[model samples]
Target chain A: PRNPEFGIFLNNRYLLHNGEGLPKPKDVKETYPECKWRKYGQWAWLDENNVQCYLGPSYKYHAYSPAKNFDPVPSIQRGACADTANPQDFPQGIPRYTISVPYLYFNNFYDRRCKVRALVKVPQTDKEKEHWIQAWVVEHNGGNWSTKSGDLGPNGPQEGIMLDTKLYPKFLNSGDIGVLPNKVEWFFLDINTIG
Target chain B: PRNPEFGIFLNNRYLLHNGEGLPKPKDVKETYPECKWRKYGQWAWLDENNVQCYLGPSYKYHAYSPAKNFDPVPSIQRGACADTANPQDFPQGIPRYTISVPYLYFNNFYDRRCKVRALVKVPQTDKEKEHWIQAWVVEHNGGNWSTKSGDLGPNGPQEGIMLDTKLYPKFLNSGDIGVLPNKVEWFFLDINTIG
Candidate 1:
């Protein structure tokens, strides 16, 4: 199959950039220009393949499970933001708000470093107040457990939130999807994704 | 020394009640009266003997160490409020805001429920916004580690916050100290203590 010069991965296949942009997921059409042209919440720049994703309407972190069963802790504080480079940032970096659970060690492999995606929805009744959903990463020495398969690096993340609501006030009530921007990054997607 | 019918503990010994009341710590004079007589915060009803106390200006829970070195978790949600009986709420009852940490299982005992006291101060600059400091108790099920000394109890508390600021709005900003009210209680003291 011929790949479009400028397109994004839709169903693992290239979807032609319809030329028009934003808020309209219909703008990006399939190469064959199918019925609804698959709509995605944000701009996505696929980095390699095979991934895990989460959709949210709930308040608990554990509700958002990654490809591998990993513990998810949100990033809501400024001081709580953290990460490292040595091994890939899966438990610490890429998977945004995931925290390393000591009890589930060996069970959650950090090495795979699979892809991750998340979508969030808010209730009309609970729309007035802002949600605490944010992104953050923290330090974990990995202690003696660094030798495990998906170890969160020798120094990855402990428990934490995701985004700092203080900095990104819009994000708290945003129905769109995104990862907080930082010096160390693993995501390049948002609710504004276009082909 | 004769114990006054209504007096409070200053330096372990009872200080005579000066017949006057609150806001003026000087009202509660020393047994025979001394220079500046110790000003105790809130009213006091010594629940027996031995105890642990904490004074705060710092925000870290670990900073407010109990008499026997315990892990402290705050209470901030309505649903987060809880407690129990039988083993004297050390890790699950009294000494509010403490959670039974599994990591420090053996290190912290549950029995020998000593008394606990805390005084909190707020800075003038950061006074407008309320603090997330609230009280809460949770179920531990003792999880097989109830045998240790200072253990949280057979069905004690797990990690949690304290005081639902939403309910007691004054508690989040007021310099005064007191525990949140609930069915099972251990505190009979507060910033309103008078002689």
Candidate 2:
């Protein structure tokens, strides 16, 4: 079973408690999990320095604002990722840090595409791997996560997280790493040896 | 009226000719005109023997074919002539030849796009310029032309002929040149010196 707990990492701190010690800490620091407001065929990353990096495909949309009032939507064809070159690996689909919207208030918007994020771990057993790798969407800073299904409209930051099953129903447990931005980070551990 | 005609000398024959000339040929053969496709872009030309060219804004039902049909409309976006190497000149949206498509197609596909054969002559006045310099869908071999509403559909033949309004509009006169297969031949005539 391959299951990965997810979360954010910034300034040498793990936003999620279930993170592992493998894959080299040097790789982690370099993994500047990027944040951005998705635009058509472009991704605008909000750096820790708070500067905006616009890769607008052609830079033709520089006049537009970087801060989107609405939650960022996903576009399988056009949504973006911060660093596509070093996407984390896993047994199934490549994990990605995606821009997710609340299912309660923005179900329709969220349904338009899939967002991405990092995968902090992978399951060891095939059965666990058969089912979707459960993940959580919590506050960006830190907070308790609930696996409950529903929407939390206008609630604030970390309003919700999503699973890819929404877009693909026959979604399997194992697959090759997909393209990045469309990809996510993965953390794997020899759980059996821990026993 | 300070009107003039344009011609180019080449290959023991001038690619252009006035109506009074003995053999009035269709299509002009120049090495190819020079201008920027956009601001600060590279200068591109069609010298390969088998390439066909298009003139302006071309539209097809698709950018790749297996599409419905060839949308036979033509449009053009013309502005001042800009050198491809000049940044200052690029943002101004200079016109471009439709040569790139045919260049690509001829290189990839075995068959050439249609060719045109016309008897070209220099425009004698402003009225003549308006009539003579109208956008032409001059394929290497005469045939129905693609439209100019938008992009060429995929799967469609990439080769065809079109002119650069920005660089050629005022310089070309009626029936001055002709195209056969993939060759454009220009006539040499100093229209400005003519009485």
Candidate 3:
């Protein structure tokens, strides 16, 4: 049960860095078909026990490290993006797009102040501490309420599309996702498109 | 005092017409210098005794005709158009774009089934009756709540803007009036803009 030398979570799961060099989570999808590694950020560094790690933002904020693993998913939702009552499933293939939290918030937690529980001291700043807590909260409470216990499956803040459909049916029926149409929030994982 | 042969509410205030053609409320600013008529739906139509008026849409639904001189407006407020946190004045000049309401709904209530008093019959249909009631309610509850009792003041549903500004300072600081950035809803007089 030896742990890998380096690891970082991306797209809905973690990827470990080995002696051969860091594997692009996107490329690793070949062996683990379930991992949909959205190219928001890439594995940066991992400490000796593989507990402390760093991840960098995508090309939008910062360029991908290798620069070659820069393929962003073409779309986030199923179909041509019409409102639907049913839970839309991702295309069956590589789980390319994942329910990822904002990379800005995600990376802030793992910045110089982070470590796995029990093995390390608390973060320096309260900001770092809360960021640490939120990262794990998202990891635990992600996906639908039904899959709160499972580590995988499409869920998290990005799942707001489903919540919007449930609470305000009129918004979907009236073709309003409650955001400025065509206004792209590059940091967000939601669909950045005009209706 | 002579009653107009025809009349219909425009921009949340009533406009009257005699044997001559309909006058732009802005033009009659001297005689009723307070009436800065917005060009939402100008001079549509009104039957004899100002009854059976035919008003156009303010962008939402049908129009109204009380079949009587409903005396829609007693006033319109201010100079050409300027900001006024002080309720004391409607700009000493000509308050052009005063706070207005759904000009669409304004005209609807004064349609064929309207009656000014208990002496007259209720509207022909339930639709007309409700429209009649709503017209008065809006007229009575127009403008910032502070100016509800004042006649010569800018008022109506546009007061919602003030409410929003006070409740959520972020919207104002963010320069977002909270409407769809480009959705052209002219009746919402608060934002006469592209955003």
Among the numbered candidates, top lDDT falls to: 2
Candidate 2's C-alpha lDDT? 0.22
Best by DockQ: 2
lDDT of 2 by residue, B22-141 (tens): 233322211123211121122122222111221211110011111111112232222111111221111223222221223322211111121211212223445344221111222221
Ranking by lDDT: 2, 1, 3
DockQ (C-alpha) of model 2? 0.01
Off by over 4 Å in 3: A1-72, A76-128, A132-195, B1-195
lDDT of 1 by residue, B59-85 (tens): 111221111222333321211223322
lDDT of 1: 0.22
Sort by TM-score, best first: 2, 1, 3
Interface RMSD of structure candidate 1 (Å) = 32.9
Tens-digit per-residue lDDT, A28-116, candidate 1: 11211211111133211111110111111111111221111223333212212232222222243344343321211111111111122
